[PDB]
Point group: D2
Chain length 299, copies 4
């Protein structure tokens, strides 16, 4: 796990902007990439859950990977989420990620159909081979995937040849500590933004998160505060993050984030893809106020 240590840090789970006809909005994607770099983010996690991967075609997901690499390769770290239910499809996205010069690939535990643990392990093996050298970030998100891995099973996955990190989207901070205890050198990303400070204390050494797109500097502020033993500042920043998260949960998180970014002059049209609907108009005053607040706070 030592080789992949340059993957440690705070990485935004990049949103995929759409135009009014729900096609990819390439100009807004480019601006959002640049907006994240200018915030001082360590990297981008592209085509993930937050990226609305599972309502895009492989072709569209590739177009997005290619554009992000064009804008950001060499400036920040780049992780391509290549995960599909199909292994073969995941491998195609892995090969493309390699071609575009990504630093690493990532795959959600394949979902919908129940698979045996061995079948999961072979899935990751195959994607790792297609990534042809790019390390794998295993992506565990039980609340959405329906896949319920034991600690022993997680231990096996994260020690597969070519695995360099775990994106742990789980609120179980006992397990977060257990994972850190077993794997002292493992890059371990906290996946739920609303427990970030507590996840770091448990053992996570960074994070990948949707809300980083609009306030990534706060999460970097929590990392700094904890490393300096400034517990009060860490808690205060986490409380501010959670105030925002409360609102985003009310509005719908991806579309709420897109709407803030629209008022921040980044995203032209803040729609998610159907069957996601639009933000309820009653929330616009609150979201506008948040965009104003954050713009004044700055990166």
């Amino acid at each position: 796990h030592h080789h992949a240590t340059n993957l440690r840090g705070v990485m935004a789970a990049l949103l995929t902007p759409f135009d009014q006809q729900q096609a990819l909005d390439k100009a807004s994607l480019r601006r959002l990439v640049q907006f994240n770099i200018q915030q001082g983010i360590d990297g981008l996690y592209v085509g993930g859950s937050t990226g609305e991967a599972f309502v895009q075609s492989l072709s569209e997901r590739e177009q997005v990977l290619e554009i992000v690499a064009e804008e950001a390769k060499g400036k920040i770290k780049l992780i391509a989420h290549v995960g599909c239910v199909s292994t073969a499809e995941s491998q195609q996205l892995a090969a493309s990620a390699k071609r575009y010069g990504f630093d690493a690939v990532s795959a959600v535990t394949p979902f919908y159909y129940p698979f045996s643990f061995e079948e999961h392990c072979d899935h990751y093996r195959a994607i790792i081979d297609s990534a042809d050298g790019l390390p794998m970030v295993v992506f565990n998100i039980p609340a959405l995937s329906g896949v319920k891995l034991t600690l022993d099973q997680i231990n096996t996955l994260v020690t597969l040849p070519g695995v360099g990190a775990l994106k742990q989207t789980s609120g179980d901070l006992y397990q977060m500590e257990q994972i850190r205890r077993e794997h002292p050198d493992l890059v371990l990303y906290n996946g739920y933004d609303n427990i970030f400070a507590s996840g770091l204390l448990a053992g996570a050494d960074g994070g990948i998160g949707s809300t980083y797109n609009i306030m990534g500097w706060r999460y970097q502020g929590i990392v700094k505060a904890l490393k300096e033993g400034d517990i009060q500042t860490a808690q205060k920043l986490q409380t501010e993050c959670n105030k925002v998260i409360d609102l985003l949960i009310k509005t719908g998180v991806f579309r709420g984030l897109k709407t803030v970014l629209h008022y921040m002059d980044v995203v032209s049209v803040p729609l998610c893809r159907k069957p996601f609907g639009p933000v309820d108009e009653k929330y616009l005053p609150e979201l506008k106020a948040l965009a104003q607040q954050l713009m004044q706070e700055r990166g």
Copy 2:
């Protein structure tokens, strides 16, 4: 609901054969369609959960819909499962099902991302529009979808304009009865094969199932027995179906089914798509013996 009455019956959830390279095996697909037609199956449900929809592209799903319509249109009923997480993707497949002359379309409640009930309704409304006259079969499968609709929510969905049926893959036979009581004319498909008899008694007036591919006549036999008041034959047949289902659950259902069909000379290569693995070789004798038993029985 009354207008869609012609959709009532016992429809097999068609498996999608693949070749050794995991591409679509079009020859085996054609054989399976005809194999089903010969069993006296009322129709086919194509590109569903059982058809491994969610490890195929839209193009692959379209190729399958087209071939099945070539083989079966006019002979039996054809339902196209067009469901995707994306609404726009589902609409493309609905349009394609319309072009190929399917009798109906169907969509699973979109999964993975949580969607509000209103969002689910709009999803079905959009797919219905794109189906341009083909009635919609709402597909409820909470165990896999993660979508847990209330009875009131189900009632709203199945009364949207253009909805002609519910595929109810739920083991809750109280809810099955409540649906039937609220919608006396609704075509109501029992989705779990291992409770088919109890499902019909509860209110289903037909079924859609994976195991119908190898023993569909047994389920038609349950419908017949229950209509005749012959409880003991119905129970005997269900018990027999469940003996097979016990085995298929051990082997893995889709791949075990394909393996039985392989031993019946229908499916050339009995593989599911990765990340599904192969059948454990220890089960092959049992699957071979089952193939023999069923061909003899037919």
Copy 3:
């Protein structure tokens, strides 16, 4: 199992009447026992889930067992639910059931604290020892107990020396069929009233149910109709039972039943014990109308 064949039938899960002071109402208990007998019920299952076992003391449960045996021993079948979380408490009730001349005992899988399967097995063995020759009815109710028995585990429990039946309060009618297939002679009570007809069809040979207190003849009617191949009449009866169950679920089932029984001049005070509250007054007209309908139907 073949020796317990005399336990086969449609048994009301007897409600435990209380007064406005929350005390046992022993006069209403006797009256309810006689009411069940007069309606032609096959037997009673006493101090169960429906009997509000888990808000009574062992002494109270014993007093209720004693009175039911006085009122009904030798006239109908009597099953004592002796189950508690504690094995020793369960054993005291089992010994008392034996003393009062019950025909069998029953125990819910002990709940709240997680116990190993072996611990559940030993629990049933100890209670069976104390029952001193009364057969055990294993009581599986996963929705409330939180105990999630596999088919293999159920097979082991129901083949313990001294088990003569399973009360299966589960909506999984594949499992119901599987149990019947594995145990051809086992007395198998359907526990969810709203799927009774379907449960019999899957392989149950009787039932234990709360609603049998007000309309047990309907469930008897379903068993008869299915035996005679009159599917239509079995369905019609199940539908009428479910119309009633819909209402009872709206009002609260045990208190709704007690309220119907109050309007039938059987139960003096239709209260359950705290923390159960009273029936919402808005529902009283429907429950009175239901009582009047059922009195008209039974004659």
Copy 4:
């Protein structure tokens, strides 16, 4: 009411109830365990809780235990009586008894088994509060065992009932932990899962109630201090040592493993839980004895 109950803040051991081989109460070992806890420097004891095997005891047994603990500890450390039963009337009896014995507060688990409406839960707590005759109520939320899943809104209503001065939050949802602190700045908020104690405090907990505090309470104390002084590394090291122990205890069964460690520490005569809990698998006894030896050495 929250500000009033500030004196209840701290690290409180969830007291085990010792039994003998005939499954009777072991009152001598109970007194020993109380005195053992006081000698460790625990802030207080939570008596007759989930850890205390409340739900396999009678009301009389539970009262006997409450009375003895008060005799041994009243005035020396804080005393919280867990009086919760499924039955409201039963819980009230225990509440009245806790008041007679001079406990500092009562507590009740959300009543379980039978589904109750939120209004019914509220009335249950109101009734017990009335019977506590002035003792603050500590609401006890443990969704994993109770099956009661309260919304945040519902929790906010419960913790602001007249008479409520604390929440024992046995939940691993540290977003909810933070939300509760944000809504109720003065609420006494006990972290309930020992294996996330440090992270729970960071999220907003201001103390805890825990089973493992019986054998290594000083570590949890040490975590509170380390965090207060901005020493993250010691807090993490302490939590890690705690989780190494908790790993073992989960393997062995937690209550019986803790009792077995206490038996090897010469505190508890017979390390049995009540049936249907079985004994510790004998293959684990070497590990539990070694653990006891380690902790004795660590505490001197």
